[PDB]
Amino acid sequence: NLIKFDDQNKVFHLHNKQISYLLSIEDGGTLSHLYFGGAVKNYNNQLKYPRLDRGFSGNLPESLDRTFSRDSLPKEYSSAGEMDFHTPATIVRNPDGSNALFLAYKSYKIEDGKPDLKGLPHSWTKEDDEAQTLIVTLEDKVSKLEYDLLYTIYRDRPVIVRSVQVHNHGEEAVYLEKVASMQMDYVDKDFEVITLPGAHANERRVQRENIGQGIKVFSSYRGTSSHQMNPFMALVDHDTNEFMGEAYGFALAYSGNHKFEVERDQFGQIHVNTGINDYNFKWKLNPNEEFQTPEVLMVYSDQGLNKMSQAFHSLIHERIMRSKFKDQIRPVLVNNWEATYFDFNEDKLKTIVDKAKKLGLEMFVLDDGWFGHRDDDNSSLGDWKVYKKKFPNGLGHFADYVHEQGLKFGLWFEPEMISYESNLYKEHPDYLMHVPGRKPCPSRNQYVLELGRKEVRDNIFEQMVKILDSKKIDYIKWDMNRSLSDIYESDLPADQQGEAYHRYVLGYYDLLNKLVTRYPDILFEGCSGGGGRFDVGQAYYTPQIWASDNTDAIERLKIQYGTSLVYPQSMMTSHVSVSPNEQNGRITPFNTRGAVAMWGDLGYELDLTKMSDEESDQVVKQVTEYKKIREVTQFGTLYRLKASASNQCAWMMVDSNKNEAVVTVVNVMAHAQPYCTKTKLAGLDPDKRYKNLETDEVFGGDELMHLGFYDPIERGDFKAKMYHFKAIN
Amino acid sequence: NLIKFDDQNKVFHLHNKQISYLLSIEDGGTLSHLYFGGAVKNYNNQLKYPRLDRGFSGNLPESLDRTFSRDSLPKEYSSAGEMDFHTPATIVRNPDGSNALFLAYKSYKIEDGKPDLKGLPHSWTKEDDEAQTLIVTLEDKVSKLEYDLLYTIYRDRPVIVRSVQVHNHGEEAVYLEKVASMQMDYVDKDFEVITLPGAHANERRVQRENIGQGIKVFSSYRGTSSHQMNPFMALVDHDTNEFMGEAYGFALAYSGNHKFEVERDQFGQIHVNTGINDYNFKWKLNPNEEFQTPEVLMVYSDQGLNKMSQAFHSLIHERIMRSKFKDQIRPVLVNNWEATYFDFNEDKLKTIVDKAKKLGLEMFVLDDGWFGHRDDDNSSLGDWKVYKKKFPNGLGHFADYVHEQGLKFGLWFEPEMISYESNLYKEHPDYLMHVPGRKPCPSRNQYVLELGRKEVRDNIFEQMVKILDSKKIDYIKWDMNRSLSDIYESDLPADQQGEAYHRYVLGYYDLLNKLVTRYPDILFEGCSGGGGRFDVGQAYYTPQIWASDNTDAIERLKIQYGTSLVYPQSMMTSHVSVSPNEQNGRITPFNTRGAVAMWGDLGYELDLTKMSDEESDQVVKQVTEYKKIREVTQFGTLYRLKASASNQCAWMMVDSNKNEAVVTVVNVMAHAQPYCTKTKLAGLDPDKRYKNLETDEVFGGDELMHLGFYDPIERGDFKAKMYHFKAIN
Amino acid sequence: ASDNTDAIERLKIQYGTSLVYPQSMMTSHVSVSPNEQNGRITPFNTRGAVAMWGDLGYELDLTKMSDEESDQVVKQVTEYKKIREVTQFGTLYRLKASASNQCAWMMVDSNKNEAVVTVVNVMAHAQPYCTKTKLAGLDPDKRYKNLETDEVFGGDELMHLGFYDPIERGDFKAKMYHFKAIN
Amino acid sequence: SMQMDYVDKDFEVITLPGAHANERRVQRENIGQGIKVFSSYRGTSSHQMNPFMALVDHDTNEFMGEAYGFALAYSGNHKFEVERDQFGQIHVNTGINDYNFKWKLNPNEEFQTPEVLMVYSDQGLNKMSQAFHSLIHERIMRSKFKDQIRPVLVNNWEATYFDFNEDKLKTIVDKAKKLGLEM
């Protein structure tokens, strides 16, 4: 079917109509990486690695053959202690104090479907014939450890998914100091590497670099996937762009500390590892226990970055996300945060609800400040009960009002966190994450809960269920506003404190999973001070995520473009906010804020009651137009057309039958003497005829893609134009 | 004098006429890096770091000030556990299992001179007024650890030297999982990074890269400084070249595992750490014990890379190297290795000695194959006694013959290594480095000794003294032909096995130090399969080192050019070898092999007895000419003029009074229709008049530097020309 | 210099012009915002700062200005009269080019006793990198007083250390500095 | 007006292209074999390409590196030619454009070209520019006002365009006086 093992040449071949992945068993049972790329029907031993005596690249135990070395061969995995001097995929500490591991091929199996990953998010299948999974087992015969390397291929996608499971079949514990989810080594490739660095209010700009000898590391230590470096990278040809050239993308399905390593070695080979960061990672694996890594999604495109992205979008949306809302149009909501910050009460919010109804909005989301005595960000996290001074008749009274006005109701929570000034801390001070004897460091004047402890998760779960069981809350914004700094888990022995970071993430996933599965009828939006936990692991739980606290239309071009390299546009949310912008002071046209906020799932986040009639009618118009196009903008195939560094940013979405397209083009800096520019479309049927719904003119798909059209020339910075095309019969 | 502390503004200033280095004590006793660069007379608080609330960059314990963060401030050091998410300079593991360290300023001292580093090579002073050293102590009041940060400034050099000493003043042990020698953080710099990657027979090519967000790592895990990545990097302006622009160079004085980290962070800052690699590094620091890191040499140049290199050359040669031979002209030797490999006996070597005398050579070096039963590289390491079948009357008889012919005598040893087929292994099998219970991996079919054990070092020391006490050996080539792979030290408890790599290097240094100090009358040349341990730490013991096993004139242009970025030319040796070249098959003119081998300390390594009379007379001529110029080529100020990527490689040396210069220009690929090229000189006195000793023509120094002259145009690949100029009175 | 009187596009035009031509040879006028040629909205202070690189003038209907804006013209003019001998005729050093997102330049009198420096930030960022400005053309051994703050710095400090640029919200922001050597 | 040919130089070329309301942006290019031409046919020196170029080292910037600047003292059609030839040499001509140029030189007559100012800097582009600034200001400009501070003027063009009369302008004059303007 999709996976074959040739027991004569010792070669495994995963293939479909799009891709082939080839690996082999080499001397000493060494698992070698041969190829990943466009599909081939057969393999005939022509990628056997040349045998050369390479100075200082040593040999197998007891071997006299100097021309084979685990330090030169391209491999599917590696360890410390095996005569390999690359950065190793795994490191084990044994009872004798050594870091020795020497893995050798033991066995394989080929299964239909793919296995569920215990305690972790993962891609899945709806029917077993959708995919097959090869599991290759490697063993160390001295320490009695086994490593299972999982490889899944879907029948109709250019994707390989990899993870690792470690098993201790010995008599004593070992400590896992590093366990990568995968390793792949390329020969004779001269790639550039694309990543998505950033910061708070500045996430996921596209960065592209040459690769020199040495190791380039893209990672997080913050206990989250982070604002500063997304858990993603792509390796591309120098000449790859959005529409042509090869690209290998790698996205780690994990929401904690990650590490992507790209090493160009002494023989010009490019060695890649991806997995949980090894920083303060030391997992005690007792006899008869197992450790499962998160998985990595690997995409191959033979025709540019849009095709790569589209494969991630489809896999994430169709076979990772589990929400019942993933295929439902997302509501046009208003969120009060930038509108009021903490300065509100029920009467104030009711006026916003009234205005939202008149403007045609579909949901009101109550943001931070509704609980405990939360007058600012210096108290009350952990006290998930209504602030009576703000809501004198309780929270249900307000939710009922929202529903009576014809809107859905959403509510913000920050379940992982605790304030010193909280009843929770007064009752359970040991729930706050710190190293005993050391005052912890604050961040936004708050601290992190010990979510690795079941009793701590149970407390928060019971508080939330007491609100949520009423079914008055249709939507939850689940936020998380600081990194982890004081790394400890108070119920673990000293020798297990290297488990604290990963147990925190496991605990987060357990609590979140319990809530999203109890409440399939609630739309969950992830948040972490914006996009600080914006990853494929998170998608499994929340089908949309607040992309950034930066709501400036213009900086959002950069953030949304980078986000879309991996993540489907329905997974990112985008709100029209006030001008001048609250984060950078930029002044933008209202129409430009709307256009950029229709790339993600549109919402509004400004005090609607302060708008003039002229501005309010503009909201009505934006909302009315978005409702006509949002099935296509939220779920259509995304093509990025122009990047903001060109002075324009442009993108479009096309429905699955290529019958409808919505295109947006934004010009950044105005010029007194501008060059004429054209926009060309993509993803259309060259033989269909498309009507421009604004002008009623009709153009062949071939014309729209090859000729394009001239962009309007207007004065003023930060101007946008949208186009809507529909195929005629 | 050179170092001031202002106790009002809490600012330390190290300065001389060339450089200033400024650091301060910031909030929470945080040691902040302000500046390193061209000298200033005074400082007036204008580099106080802006105070901004940066999302997710948290704050000091118990602080309400959100605008100060150890995650944003530029610092002189850092740790895990202090709310910094950069790659940390140090990581400590405490008895409670945490990785917490929170260092705060405690005190300072300012001393004349600089302290000796116990057990390690280091720069030094001849008089105390040559330099001053600031030591700043930081403490963790909970774990009772103190970190001393050493900073030395020389009065007349653009250099700062840094190291760290950790002290445990607590009641229980801690484990040091990482201790960098230094950290420096730059604000608003857009640097490129230069390093010296390579491989066996391909060391130290110059590589230059842009720096993107993330961490770039240049390192070794091989137990040696390595062929693959030298322990050096330079940060430069985009427009820096050999003759202009700023450069910051960093060279680690250590001959084991190194790690250079260059992190461009979320706020555009460039954070650098350098020190012992943290890979399998876990040092048990008991109460009342200390741990000293190696030091790093930091050079600032305001006028290009030659000036940077020249500062390293001068510091290494004058104040690191200790050999009595460091200021003595180096002999023109012949080494028999490529001439015979293992296929020789005494009669064969005596014929080479006879021919060497006739050619005017000064020393015969007997290479591998003279000891044990060493017929090939598959036995005998560890058995340092003469092979009687090859030398029937003993080694002394042959040395006496060499001396009677008027030549000095040199001898190869590989003291760190052991073969299974050796008497040493038969007598002391536990001396071989391996993880008990696991067969170790071979490399060149040999294994490494447990040099961390005194009894193992004592054995090798006594064997060597038995040969060397005769004073018949004038020179030693100390080789080392494999990396460490099975990392263990059999006399240490399990919890100290993270000390094995560093104890190996300490043991190596102890043995080597004992021998170079017992034998100040012997010239030691370092070697490790060529330049596999070519570093500033090694210079302290051996004043010259075999640069590469690649003896092709043309690839040696690349290797020697890169080597010279840090290392003075008298520290690298270079031999004329046979054509076609034994390593790559290249055919080169004899004159080109000579010219390239006169950049390093010249020698010959080919079977002199097989030369025709015509070739032998060419050796006579090369040797005669080298003896006339070698004081200037070995010890003059080096200027690189052209890099081989331009199709030419050119360099020159100028004596300290600018009265004499020797220039070499090598053309690589011939062209049928060549462009005319010119060579311009550097480092001359514009007001002196220089005679070309070949043509008798005389030119002003200004003419030679500004006008230059035309290179000869000749057919054929790989052609060289040399020039010798002397100032006239 | 140009019919384009937008402060921001004038950074590009004035920088290029100065590659050959002395700054007293180019004229520069404060004009209305939004700009008449490209529609850009700029702070009045930024239009003034950029128009003091060339020989300053005004080209807008003064009679339509509010009292608050008119008093800002008074202030600009008063300050320009104090510095224009140095800005019009001092030695020009370009420091930063607008492609870096900042444009900066300065003028120094013939005896290196007085300097006037201008730094303009183009695009605002929510999470900005800290930037420094270093000076040029000073005497490393003179001591220069910042006339706004009264603080005093060696010429060597101003050229080698520089100082941090202010961090503010909003696009198209400018700051000027005036230094004078003390005796 | 001149020709100069360089041997074994690998220069980049800096010019000042533009358009109306977009003059003199700095452009910097590598030089390949063939002829690169920077010129005007418009009867004026032009908005589209200033009569200037500089040849610089790849690593030259505002503060370091060599630069050769060339400015043609002519206000009509110019042509700057930079030819990298078959032997790697860089051949430069500068002068009046040859486009529709055919001058009848009768017996006993002469034809004088405009001159070209050639500056060499060994230390960056600011030093190059400063040499042009000084030469132009001190030994080309002849105005009695060249060394006099220039007035802070108001110009009515963007203020009124053609829509004015004397009474309207007198109100602007009145306001200019109150604001301290000089012309």
Ligand SMILES: OC[C@H]1O[C@H](O)[C@H](O)[C@@H](O)[C@H]1O
């Ligand atoms: O405190 C409330 C707040 O927290 C974060 O910064 C979020 O990302 C915001 O959208 C807002 O919810």
Ligand SMILES: OC[C@H]1O[C@H](O)[C@H](O)[C@@H](O)[C@H]1O
């Ligand atoms: O075995 C002998 C040999 O070992 C190495 O490769 C050295 O670098 C050589 O110069 C030679 O001494």
